[PDB]
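ok posting inputs for the copper (II) ion job
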Amino acid sequence: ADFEVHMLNKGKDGAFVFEPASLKVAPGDTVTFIPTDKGHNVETIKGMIPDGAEAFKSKINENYKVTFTAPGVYGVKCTPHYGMGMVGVVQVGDAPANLEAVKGAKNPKKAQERLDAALAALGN
Ligand SMILES: [Cu+2]
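and the output
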């Protein structure tokens, strides 16, 4: 299955946001990160991906499709806007085995608030 996440200068949640900021997919599914506004990319947050998963980092303004195979929760960020809270979470499969690990990772304050909210929204 093929999902979309938009990268925006502003949204419901404030400035510099992924929409949706939380997404549940199945192993083998894809997500395309879409540059609705210029100046954004997507990068896994180091330390916030499941055992055996590969890190990734797209180019600014790249329409970037990623296939998620390793089950677990993945924290993602926009490289330039991370400190300003531009983050998201993708959960792959049920019963993520790395939830408390991800819940405990340290991030910029504005990013941490949005990560916490995205994790809550996933029912974690
Ligand atoms: Cu950005």
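notes: The radius of gyration is 13 Å. The chain has two helices and eight strands.
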